[PDB]
């Protein structure tokens, strides 16, 4: 259940001693390292040509957040506050009130992207599949306050990436 790494005893005979002396005076293993670098010179490099050649991903990828809708126009969230209660970094702030038709809908839904750790607790604690973690990751901003998403930005992101979010959910909903 164990092996004696680096305990081999070197030989003593004249041929092996002459071989070791020849390797000492002629630097054989340095030539071996040179040959390995020369072998790596003639391979196909694994470099992709960004931004024309994106790296492979998965349908389960966690990126920018978005708010979904039912397939009739109604927003999915009913302000149950499970996501802000399960968010470990407290990035989600929710304030709700009954709207004109008496439906339990949000009034403030803020996600601080600089607080968010992108772990998908909100997208897995949502009972109505409202909040999702979309596949977008190219959304870096030049200003700090642009990473403070309110409800309007999240709804616009959902309307922008619904055609991909629906397909990803249809792909991955049977594992949940």
């Amino acid at each position: 259940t164990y092996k004696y790494v680096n305990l081999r005893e070197p030989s003593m005979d004249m041929k092996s001693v002459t071989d070791r002396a020849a390797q000492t005076l002629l630097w054989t293993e340095l030539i071996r390292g040179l040959g390995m670098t020369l072998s790596y010179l003639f391979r196909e490099p694994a470099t992709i040509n960004y931004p024309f050649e994106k790296g492979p991903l998965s349908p389960r990828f966690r990126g920018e957040h978005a708010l979904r809708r039912y397939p009739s126009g109604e927003e999915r969230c009913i302000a149950c506050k499970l996501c802000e209660a399960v968010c470990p970094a407290q990035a989600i702030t929710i304030e709700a009130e009954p709207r004109a038709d008496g439906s339990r809908r949000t009034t403030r839904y803020d996600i601080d992207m600089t607080k968010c750790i992108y772990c998908g607790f909100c997208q897995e604690a949502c009972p109505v599949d409202a909040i999702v973690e979309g596949p977008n990751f190219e959304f870096s901003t030049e200003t700090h306050e642009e990473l403070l998403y309110n409800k309007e930005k999240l709804l616009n992101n959902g309307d922008k990436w619904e055609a991909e979010i629906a397909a990803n959910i249809q792909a991955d909903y049977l594992y949940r």
Binding site: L41, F42, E44, P45
Partner: protein, 70 residues
């Protein structure tokens, strides 16, 4: 692939081809179509000075042949 290191290296080749041959061309221009004569020892310098004095133009590469004598 690997052969794309061959363009830039080739530029290096041009960057190592320009100077030295240029000196040879310079040595073929000032010295009248011959090599620039070397003077490692004082006998060669004395022959250089004798040639410069005997040319009559104060240029040592102006070679005067056997038609000069009677």
């Amino acid at each position: 692939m690997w052969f794309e290191v061959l363009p830039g290296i080739a530029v290096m080749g041009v960057c190592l081809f320009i100077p030295g041959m240029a000196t040879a061309r310079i040595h073929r221009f000032s010295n009248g179509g011959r090599e620039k004569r070397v003077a490692h020892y004082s006998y060669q310098w004395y022959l250089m000075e004798r040639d410069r004095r005997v040319s009559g133009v104060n240029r040592y590469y102006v070679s005067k042949g056997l038609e000069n004598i009677d």
